[PDB]
Write an enzyme that holds these catalytic residues in place. Structure first.
Site, PDB file in Angstrom:
ATOM      1  N   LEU A  33       0.973  -1.197   0.213  1.00  0.00           N
ATOM      2  CA  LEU A  33      -0.237   0.180  -0.124  1.00  0.00           C
ATOM      3  C   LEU A  33       1.200   1.375  -0.113  1.00  0.00           C
ATOM      4  O   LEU A  33       1.941   1.026  -0.050  1.00  0.00           O
ATOM      5  CB  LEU A  33      -0.683  -0.048   1.208  1.00  0.00           C
ATOM      6  N   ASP A  34       0.318   2.490  -0.050  1.00  0.00           N
ATOM      7  CA  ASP A  34       0.492   4.090   0.465  1.00  0.00           C
ATOM      8  C   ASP A  34       0.939   4.348   1.738  1.00  0.00           C
ATOM      9  O   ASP A  34       0.649   4.493   2.151  1.00  0.00           O
ATOM     10  CB  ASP A  34      -0.088   4.339  -0.669  1.00  0.00           C
TER      11      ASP A  34
END
Ligand code: MYR
Lengths: 459, 70, 111, 65, 50, 155, 128, 79, 177, 165, 62, 171, 87, 122
Positions: free
Chosen positions: M41-42
């Site tokens: 993810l970020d």
């Protein structure tokens, strides 16, 4: 008054003959017995003074001060018997001897029939207070405070001596009853100007007047607890009693003379109170509160109205008891935390609930909560000064803010908030401290029921 | 359940001080108020009367309550 | 006169006695808020009765029941003035404070 | 017992609070409707306010001029 | 507290009230005014002539 | 305690300033003493005049109430800037805009109250007509003297 | 556009609007590292003196004693009488006194003049 | 003590205004990543809350019925 | 700015702080859940518009103008959690967090009604007073010249050794006394 | 005023304790049916605050409006008095719309409970008080002054029109 | 022991205050001052027995 | 008891309660229950205490003072008789303050007793109060906190001199 | 009132909040999953997830602590040390 | 409330001033006008303890209503008819006051018309 002097002169060998472990108990028992016998001076009249002989008399003004003095001395012996537990037996007995001699000096001074006897006894009160301050004080610079106190008192009181001897040589006597019956008006002349100044400046020094109050924020701090109590609760009232006696002799010049001095208080008690808004030392805050109350006393005495006199004596007694209790509270907290910094010890309510209750009661009695004696005295002073002029209500009313604005502030920082982390030597409350503070507080709440005995000589 | 020990300062000393203060106040307060109410009920108060001719009373006869007269 | 003054003064004394009761306490109380709530409700009844008699008749009075100070020419005494404002304000405040007793008994049980 | 907690749903409610709320709402509406049918004066109008400019001249004492 | 609660009629002040209870009783009987505006008798005062 | 760990006079040359910064445990550049105006500040440094509320509360402080670490050299006026006293936290609106808005609002309302006091409102009816010469006897007038009688007629 | 924040004496500039916070120069980096090291050393000293089992008392804070002595006893040895201090003492020390004395003398003269000509309402004033 | 959570399959994006927000975002070209977390607030007993006029008129029917009954009783008890 | 471990806030930390504060203020201004979700998606798209950047100066005054816009569009009364500072319930029960060392001042009469707990407290005190010496020995050697640079503390290294300066963190008072 | 202000504050405190001391109204809603008695108490208190006819406030507040227009008074004072009445109505129904109506916003752990005899009995007593004490006091006090009776129709509906607007 | 709270708190202070008012407060003059009751035309007084004459004949308006 | 002349009270006129409704008033039953529960035991206790008082009776008297020549018949700087004159003047001051207290109590009692008709039914009390405070201000006001008989004598001489110049300027 | 919470319930609630996320899958979500390394993810997703738990548990986690809550077990650890579990 | 508009925004020389009103003699165009009559005797109206603001021409209905409030205890709503009668009498008094206001307004308007006639005639 030879029924009270001889018991103190017999208390002197009583503390010079006891064992090393029984001095405190015997002195406390016998001083409390003398305090019990002290109530016989209340046989007063609304029109005459109780005279015993040619040298001693007591009206309804000096009687509450006498009762306060020989009630305060046993409290002094309780308050000063722990931090001197490491001292030598000879020095401990000398300390008790100085306290007993100071009580004898005060009870001889408050009943002086003639004014020259009052003056010499008034200057004789210097010696044990100076000895206590310069010997048993804690901080380094206590010598400066002792020198300042002694020199302010002497430089005030020597022109008082010159004026008193001049008055005696002029008219013929210095008895207060004779001067009550042989009084003469003083015209508006420069000789009478300097006579008024010489007769007043000693008492304005010992009250203290604003401007000449600089001996209080030092000598009230570095002195021990007994010296702090005898400086805060008796000697200022000694100067006030002297000014009350003297101001009869200086009419009608004062009606145009006391314009600066009154107003030298009428602004000063503002800004000195503001100093309590920005004080890092708790004992200095208590001393400046005493300065403000004595400035109110100065205004009340100098306007010479009856209601002002009643308010002056009521505020004198109430402020003496409250300031003694506050000084005892400061001494107990300083003993527990070993520092006089107010910002250091915080959150003491979570550790000391009963001491927090005593702090709350002392702070409430300091801000003139009715129906305590302090509210009665300050209210009578405000009524009298509003009779004097209108706009001065502002000069009192704003003080009504600032007093609260420091006193509850003194209640907040020392009691309310998150407690300090590194301070972990806060012991539980000693029974001696609780007994001393109850003995300070309960007489005030009991006299709140019947204040008619401490409302002055002309009630 | 799950009782947790409430950490609190020591409450023995202040309670002992308050208990002994109440005890030593009451140990003399009760007999003096019993004596006062027995003086009020049994001995009783005075009565106002005009001064008879030829009588000079003592000073304590000019007061009403028996404790004040004493 | 006999019922009104006595009932108002015992309303005041009934409301002021739990302070002395808790100040003369040695042990731990068993539901002290319940006791003070019962005291508040009983004082509400004891103050509502002379309110009802004032509504019936229209009787107001002043009682100076303790000569405290006689200072110069001024006389200060413990004086209670029962007039329309006090008559119709005291039971309302006592009823609201009774509800406050009950809600504070429920609310601050964790304290 | 007490009301057990629930996760992301409506909490369990007993009969007492529901019937209490319904009875008090019904009491309020019955009281206002009964007082509106009985009095109907303090809210809608009590006394006829007469028009100031419509008073006749002969009873107000102004001569014809 | 027992002693201060029972001073023998302090400063004669209560007695003064009793004296007042006599005095107006005198002055409401003989038709005299309630209180004279002169503390001393004006017939025994010699003003300085000018 | 010791004498050289205590404040002294105002330093002038660089090495006295470095010694003062060592004593006050700041950098030699962050130590800015008060100007020598003869007021008595001594060698005490000038902190940037910020309240203790401006400090991050999520930081773990030695004194959480004052948000001050142990031995951190505090402000000369620290008792002014405690969390129970004068603050300097930023506001959503500008300060001068706040002051002019408040002053204009209160001045406009006072002017409106003045012009409403000058221009009152009333109901177009006559005065309250009272009996007995506008109630002379009940108002405390002396019954021995007879004032001028007013008489209220029908309409 | 936007209304730019104008700081005042009682409204400080927000920390995220400061240009000096947005500086990535090396000198700011060494200044931040040096003050972090100083703060870490002081914190280490505090929790070393704080977690000691043998110690039962007050941990001495030199900064607090330094502040109290700077506020209380070190104000007079570092005082020089110059024109600024003299002007501030003359404006604040005696100005309010003479102003209050003048206004009170005027008010009391007016009240005495009104009373001595018998115009002030003093009919029921018997307490003074 | 330990509270047992219900199944997570029941929290669906539909039945909400959240799907309307999601399709407007898709019309602009985005996606909603928290439909299921906020889907509990609009599903269950909290669905279809009353308006303010419904809140003000709470208990009006039974109050009106009791008013009619009481006014009929007092209308018939005067004779 | 002012952090315990790091001497400065990097660009990533500033961006994440701005994003979190913007989301909090947007949730305050957009009380209803669906409006908040829509505008949070819009704000995430706006943040992802300038995510892939290669010039540091461009990111610098882009962050400056973004912070200025966030200051302009903030809620004057943002939502604050009850336990967060500035909240209604912040540090309330801190008034009841009595420290443990006061238990050393209890009377023996009131110490006799909790025997087992005070025995376990005595064992903990003995453990502290036997761990202090080796914890300060560990902290002495691990500290480099000039003291520690960061405020981070080294953990326990040897088996049977407690972490240094652990008493006033492990025995801190509970949240709900 | 005392009865329904105590009611409003006391029901608000009940709601605050029921939702883990979350005091902001922006994290609320959906309490119309979860708290039936509390919603009834809050609605009745808000109606008494606004000046709903034949409640307690109508027996005082509306009456002073009838004395605030037909008197030799300041015009601007009466104007902002009426605007303040409108504002009271506005924020009362704002509190109703945000706290009671709408959709839930509290955290997912629901701890809504009010089945305690003390709270129920206390709010019931305050509810009966707010229902009938205004009528009892307004019909039981002796007539102290002269109420205003003859006064036009547009001034009569002023308080109700301001509240409805 | 079911009705202690209505006796040890109420009746004993009622007796004490009633005695203290009946034989220590109302004995002294002007401590308790009672407003004279309302008298209407047509009323009967217990202390005197003289009945008030009725008011004037009403000029009715409706 | 108290003397009726020094604290006068007009006779009370309590109306007969004429019932017009069928609902019984609970205040009558409350008064009957109060007299059945409270009046009888308190009366019995007071009767017992009065019997215990009447067993042992003793008298106390009211102190009196004869008349001495006042401060105007005293040689100056002669203490042994002018002290007595000052003593008697202070006693007269205290008695006169109590007289003013009596008049104030009369005025307040008149106002509270007459209630809403105080503007009409207490003209005599207010007139006597105004007279006594005018005479009190003419006697004792502006003396100061150190008042004596010499100061009051000087004030009376000043007032009579002002009266003399008033009648000289009016003739 | 104020029911106590257990650590098993804490991880159950945290996994419940995680499992409703649309940028995550309910298959390979575990209690020892790194958000960018093992899950992908970020950082924006990380701060938004931290804000999601801050809204869920009703209290504010500071950013200095928020940057390090990097696995579900570490989030459970932070909640556990904040709320004083296992008493 | 158009009288404020006619007095303030128009001209102030034709509308009456309620502070000083009436400015004209009562005997203007009113042959053998009657005097409004008291019913309550001043002693009976005095010993009833009426507030001085309430002591207007219609005190008799106030006395009757107070007597009915006294006797009909505890049924406080038993005899509201007397309250309605007192309110009706107060309404009639207010009607008479408003009629006096309209008469004063018409007389001021007629005085303005007379001075207009003088201006346009002489
Ligand atoms: C003329 O308007 C006479 C009425 C009284 C003066 C005006 C009062 C205006 C405010 C009350 C009415 C508001 C109607 C919306």
């Amino acid at each position: 008054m030879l029924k009270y002097i001889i018991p103190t002169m017999m208390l002197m060998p009583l503390t010079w003959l006891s064992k090393n472990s029984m001095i405190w108990i015997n002195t406390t028992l016998h001083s409390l017995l003398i305090s019990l016998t002290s109530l016989l001076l209340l046989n007063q009249f609304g029109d005459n003074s109780l005279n015993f002989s040619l040298t001693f008399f007591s009206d309804s003004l000096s009687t509450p001060l006498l009762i306060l003095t020989m009630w305060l001395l046993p409290l002094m012996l309780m308050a000063s018997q722990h931090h001197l537990s490491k001292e030598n037996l000879a020095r401990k007995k000398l300390f008790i001897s100085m306290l007993i001699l100071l009580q004898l000096f005060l009870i001889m001074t408050f009943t002086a029939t003639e004014l020259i006897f009052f003056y010499i006894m008034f200057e004789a009160t210097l010696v044990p207070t100076l000895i206590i301050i310069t010997r048993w004080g804690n901080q380094t610079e206590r010598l400066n405070a002792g020198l300042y106190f002694l020199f302010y008192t002497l430089a005030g009181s020597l022109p008082l001596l010159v004026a008193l001897i001049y008055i005696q040589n002029t008219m013929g006597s210095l008895n207060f009853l004779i001067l009550q019956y042989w009084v003469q008006p003083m015209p508006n002349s420069w000789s009478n100007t300097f006579m008024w100044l010489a007769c007043m400046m000693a008492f304005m020094v010992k009250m203290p007047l604003y401007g000449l109050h600089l001996w209080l924020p030092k000598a009230h701090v570095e002195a021990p607890i007994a010296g702090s109590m005898v400086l805060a609760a008796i000697l200022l009232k000694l100067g006030g009693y002297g000014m009350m006696r003297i101001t009869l002799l200086l009419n009608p010049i004062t009606d145009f003379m006391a314009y600066p001095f009154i107003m030298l208080s009428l602004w000063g008690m503002i800004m000195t109170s503001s100093i309590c808004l920005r004080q890092t030392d708790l004992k200095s805050l208590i001393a400046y509160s005493s300065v403000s109350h004595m400035a109110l006393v100065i205004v009340a005495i100098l306007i010479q109205t009856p209601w002002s006199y009643m308010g002056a004596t009521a505020l004198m007694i109430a402020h003496g008891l409250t300031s003694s209790m506050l000084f005892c509270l400061a001494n107990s907290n300083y003993e527990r935390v070993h520092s006089r910094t107010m910002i250091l010890a915080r959150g003491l309510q979570t550790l000391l609930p009963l001491m927090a209750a005593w702090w709350l009661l002392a702070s409430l009695t300091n801000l003139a909560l009715p129906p305590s004696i302090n509210l009665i005295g300050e209210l009578f002073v405000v009524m009298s000064t509003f009779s004097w002029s209108n706009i001065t209500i502002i000069l009192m009313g704003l003080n009504m803010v600032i007093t609260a604005l420091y006193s509850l502030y003194m209640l907040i920082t020392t009691q309310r908030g998150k407690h300090t982390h590194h301070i972990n030597n806060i012991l539980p409350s000693f029974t001696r401290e609780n007994a001393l503070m109850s003995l300070h507080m309960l007489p005030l709440l009991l006299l709140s029921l019947n204040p008619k005995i401490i409302l002055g000589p002309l009630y | 359940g799950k009782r947790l020990f409430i950490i609190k300062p020591s409450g023995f000393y202040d309670k002992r001080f308050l208990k002994l203060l109440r005890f030593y106040i009451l140990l003399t307060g009760i007999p003096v108020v019993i004596g006062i109410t027995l003086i009020n009920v049994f001995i009783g108060e005075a009565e106002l009367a005009e001064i008879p001719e030829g009588y000079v009373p003592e000073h304590w006869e000019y007061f009403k309550h028996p404790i004040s007269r004493w | 006169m006999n019922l009104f003054s006595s009932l108002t003064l015992v309303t005041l004394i009934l409301l002021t006695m739990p302070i002395a009761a808790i100040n003369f306490n040695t042990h731990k109380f068993t539901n002290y808020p319940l006791y003070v709530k019962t005291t508040i409700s009983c004082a509400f009844i004891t103050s509502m009765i002379p309110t009802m008699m004032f509504i019936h008749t229209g009787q107001e009075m002043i009682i100076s029941n303790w000569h405290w100070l006689t200072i110069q020419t001024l006389k200060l005494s413990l004086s209670f003035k029962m007039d329309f404002f006090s008559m119709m304000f005291v039971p309302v405040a006592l009823f609201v404070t009774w509800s406050i007793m009950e809600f504070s008994m429920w609310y601050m049980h964790s304290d | 017992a007490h009301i057990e907690p629930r996760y992301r749903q409506f909490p369990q409610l007993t009969r007492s609070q529901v019937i209490q709320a319904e009875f008090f709402s019904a009491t309020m509406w019955f009281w206002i409707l009964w007082r509106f049918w009985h009095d109907s004066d303090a809210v809608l109008g009590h006394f006829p306010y007469p028009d100031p400019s419509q008073w006749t001249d002969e009873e107000l004492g102004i001569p014809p001029d | 507290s027992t002693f201060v609660a029972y001073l023998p009629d302090y400063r004669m002040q209560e007695w003064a009230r009793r004296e007042a209870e006599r005095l107006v009783k005198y002055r409401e009987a003989h038709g005299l005014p309630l209180m004279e505006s002169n503390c001393f008798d004006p017939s025994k005062i010699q003003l300085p002539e000018d | 305690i010791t004498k050289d760990m205590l404040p002294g006079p105002y330093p002038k040359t660089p090495e006295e300033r470095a010694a003062a910064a060592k004593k006050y445990n700041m950098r030699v550049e962050d130590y800015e003493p008060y100007p020598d105006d003869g007021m008595g500040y001594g060698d005490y440094p000038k902190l940037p005049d910020r309240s203790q509320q401006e400090r991050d509360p999520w930081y773990d402080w030695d004194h959480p109430d004052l948000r001050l670490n142990w031995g951190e050299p505090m402000h000369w006026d620290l008792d002014m800037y405690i969390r129970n006293r004068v603050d300097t936290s930023p506001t959503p609106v500008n300060w001068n805009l706040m002051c002019k808005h408040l002053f204009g609002f209160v001045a406009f309302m006072l002017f409106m109250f003045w012009v409403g006091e000058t221009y009152p409102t009333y109901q177009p009816v006559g005065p309250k007509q009272y009996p007995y010469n506008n109630l002379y006897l009940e108002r405390g007038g002396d019954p021995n003297k007879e004032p001028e009688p007013v008489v209220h007629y029908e309409i | 556009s936007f209304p730019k924040y104008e700081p005042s004496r009682l409204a400080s500039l927000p920390t995220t609007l400061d240009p000096a916070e947005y500086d990535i120069s090396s000198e700011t980096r060494k200044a931040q590292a040096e003050r972090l090291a100083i703060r870490s050393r002081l914190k280490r000293e505090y929790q070393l003196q704080y977690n000691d089992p043998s110690r039962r008392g007050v941990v001495e804070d030199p900064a607090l004693i330094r502040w109290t002595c700077a506020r209380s006893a070190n104000v007079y040895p570092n005082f020089r009488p110059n024109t600024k201090t003299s002007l501030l003492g003359a404006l604040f020390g005696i100005g309010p006194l003479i102003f209050w004395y003048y206004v009170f003398k005027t008010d009391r003269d007016r009240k005495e003049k009104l009373i001595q000509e018998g115009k002030l309402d003093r009919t029921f004033n018997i307490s003074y | 003590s330990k509270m047992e959570l219900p199944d997570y399959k029941q929290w669906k994006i539909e039945g909400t205004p959240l799907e309307t927000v999601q399709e407007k975002l898709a019309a602009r070209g985005l996606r909603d990543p928290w439909g299921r977390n906020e889907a509990w607030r609009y599903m269950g007993g909290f669905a279809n809350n009353v308006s303010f006029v419904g809140a003000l008129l709470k208990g009006f029917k039974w109050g009106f019925a009791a008013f009619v009954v009481a006014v009929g009783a007092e209308y018939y008890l005067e004779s | 700015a002012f952090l315990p471990s790091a001497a400065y806030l990097t660009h990533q930390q500033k961006v994440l702080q701005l994003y979190k504060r913007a989301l909090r203020h947007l949730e305050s201004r957009c009380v209803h859940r669906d409006k908040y979700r829509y505008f949070a998606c819009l704000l995430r798209a706006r943040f992802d518009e300038h995510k892939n950047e290669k010039d540091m100066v461009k990111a610098t005054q882009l962050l400056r103008e973004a912070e200025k816009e966030f200051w302009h569009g903030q809620h004057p009364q943002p939502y604050i959690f009850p336990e967060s500072p500035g909240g209604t319930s912040y540090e309330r029960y801190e008034c009841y967090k009595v420290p443990e060392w006061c238990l050393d001042d209890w009377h023996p009469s009131e110490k006799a009604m909790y025997p087992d707990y005070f025995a376990k407290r005595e064992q903990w005190k003995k453990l502290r007073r036997e761990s202090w010496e080796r914890e300060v020995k560990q902290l002495q050697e691990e500290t480099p010249v000039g003291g520690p640079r960061t405020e981070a503390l080294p953990p326990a290294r040897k088996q049977g050794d407690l972490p240094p300066l652990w008493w006033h963190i492990v025995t801190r008072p509970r949240e709900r006394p | 005023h005392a009865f329904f202000k105590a009611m409003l504050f006391m029901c608000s405190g009940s709601i605050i304790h029921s939702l883990n001391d979350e005091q902001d109204i922006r994290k609320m809603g959906g309490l119309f049916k979860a708290m039936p008695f509390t919603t009834t108490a809050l609605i009745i208190g808000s109606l008494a605050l606004t000046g709903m006819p034949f409640l307690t406030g109508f027996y005082s507040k509306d009456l002073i409006i009838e004395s605030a227009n037909t008197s030799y008074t300041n015009a601007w004072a009466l104007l902002m008095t009426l605007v303040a009445t409108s504002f009271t109505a506005i924020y009362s129904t704002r509190i109703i719309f945000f706290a009671l109506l709408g959709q839930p916003r509290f955290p997912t752990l629901i701890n809504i409970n009010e089945n305690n005899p003390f709270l129920i009995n206390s709010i019931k007593r305050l509810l009966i008080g707010s229902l009938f004490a205004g009528f009892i006091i307004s019909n039981n006090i002796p007539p102290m002054t002269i109420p205003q009776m003859t006064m036009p129709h547009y001034l009569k509906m002023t308080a109700l029109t301001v509240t409805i607007l | 022991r079911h009705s202690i709270f209505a006796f040890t708190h109420v009746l004993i202070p009622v007796w004490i205050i009633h005695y203290y008012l009946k034989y220590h407060v109302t004995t002294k003059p002007y401590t308790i001052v009672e407003k004279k009751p309302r008298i209407f035309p047509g009323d009967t007084i217990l202390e005197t027995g003289e009945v008030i004459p009725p008011m004037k004949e009403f000029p009715d308006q409706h | 008891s108290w003397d009726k002349d020094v604290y006068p009270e007009p006779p009370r006129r309590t109306p007969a309660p004429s019932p017009q409704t069928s609902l019984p008033n609970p205040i009558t039953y409350l008064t009957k229950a109060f007299d059945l529960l409270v009046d009888r035991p308190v009366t019995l206790v007071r009767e017992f205490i009065e019997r215990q008082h009447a067993k042992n009776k003793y008298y106390y008297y009211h102190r009196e003072f004869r008349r001495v020549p006042d401060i105007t018949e005293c040689h100056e700087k002669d203490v042994l008789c002018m002290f007595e004159a000052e003593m008697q003047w202070k006693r007269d001051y205290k008695v006169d303050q109590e007289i003013v207290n009596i008049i104030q109590e009369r005025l307040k009692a008149c106002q509270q007793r007459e209630g809403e008709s105080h503007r009409q039914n207490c003209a005599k009390e207010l007139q006597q109060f105004t007279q006594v405070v005018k005479a009190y201000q003419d006697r004792y006001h502006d003396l100061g906190a150190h008042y004596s008989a010499r100061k009051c004598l000087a004030k009376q001489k000043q007032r009579m001199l002002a009266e003399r110049k008033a009648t000289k300027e009016a003739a | 009132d104020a029911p106590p919470l257990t650590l098993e319930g804490i991880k159950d609630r945290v996994l419940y909040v995680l499992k409703l996320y649309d940028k995550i899958d309910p298959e390979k979500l575990s209690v020892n999953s790194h958000f960018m390394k093992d899950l992908g993810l970020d950082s924006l997703d990380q701060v938004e997830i931290i804000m999601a738990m801050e809204d869920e548990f009703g209290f504010e986690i500071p950013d200095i602590d928020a940057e390090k809550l990097m696995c579900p077990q570490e989030i459970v650890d932070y909640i556990a040390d904040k709320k004083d579990v296992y008493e | 409330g158009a009288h404020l508009a006619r007095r303030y925004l128009g001209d102030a020389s034709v509308e009456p001033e309620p502070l000083r009103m009436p400015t004209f003699p009562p005997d203007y165009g009113f042959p053998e006008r009657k005097e409004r009559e008291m019913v309550a005797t001043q002693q009976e109206m005095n010993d009833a303890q009426l507030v001085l603001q309430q002591r207007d021409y219609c005190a008799h209905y106030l006395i009757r209503f107070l007597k009915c409030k006294r006797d009909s205890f505890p049924n406080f709503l038993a005899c509201k008819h007397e309250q309605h009668d007192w309110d009706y009498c107060e309404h009639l008094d207010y009607v008479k006051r408003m009629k006096e206001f309209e008469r004063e307004r018409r007389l001021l308007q007629r005085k303005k018309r007379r001075e207009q006639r003088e201006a346009d005639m002489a």
